[PDB]
Amino acid sequence: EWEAIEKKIAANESKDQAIEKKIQAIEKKIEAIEHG
Amino acid sequence: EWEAIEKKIAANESKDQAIEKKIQAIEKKIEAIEHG
Amino acid sequence: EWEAIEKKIAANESKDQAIEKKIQAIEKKIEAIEHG
Ligand SMILES: [Tb+3]
Ligand SMILES: [Tb+3]
Ligand SMILES: [Tb+3]
Ligand SMILES: [Zn+2]
Ligand SMILES: [Zn+2]
Ligand SMILES: [Zn+2]
């Protein structure tokens, strides 16, 4: 159980980090729009 | 104790997945604005 | 590991909450950007 949960948590952090990257790319596109 | 942790983890995956759906919708709107 | 697991989960939750807040703000700004 300890290692099966450890693996689920590690996968969540990895996915939480890929979400963060997609958000930065979105913020940059928006930045570009707001500066004509 | 273990089953409560398992429930918290399943809830975290559900939220993380909803966020991913929303991000998909945002990308579509931003591309419509880019080149209308 | 019990309490260390719960500490990792608490961190995932606050991190996902911060992402939730940014999504709200981005969704508002996109509609405002579409308005004008
Ligand atoms: Tb998460
Ligand atoms: Tb179980
Ligand atoms: Tb505790
Ligand atoms: Zn372990
Ligand atoms: Zn291990
Ligand atoms: Zn506990």
Cβ atoms of C13 and B12 within 8 Å: the answer is yes
The method of structure determination was: X-ray
Domain boundaries, chain A: 1-36
Distance in angstroms (rounded) separating the CA atoms of residues C18 and A35: 26
Alpha helix (H) ranges present in chain B?
2-34
C4-33 residues touching A, CB cutoff 8 A:
5, 8-9, 12, 15-16, 19, 22-23, 26, 29-30, 33
Q: Are C16 and A16 an interchain contact pair (Cβ–Cβ within 8 Å)?
A: yes
**CA pair distance C33, B27, nearest whole angstrom:** 14
Task: Give the closest residue to A31 by CA, choosing from B17, B33, C2, B10.
Answer: B33
Angle subtended by helix axes B2-34 and C2-35, to nearest 10: 20
CA distance C9 to chain B (A): 8
Resolution in A: 2.1
Tokens at residue C1, please? 């590991």
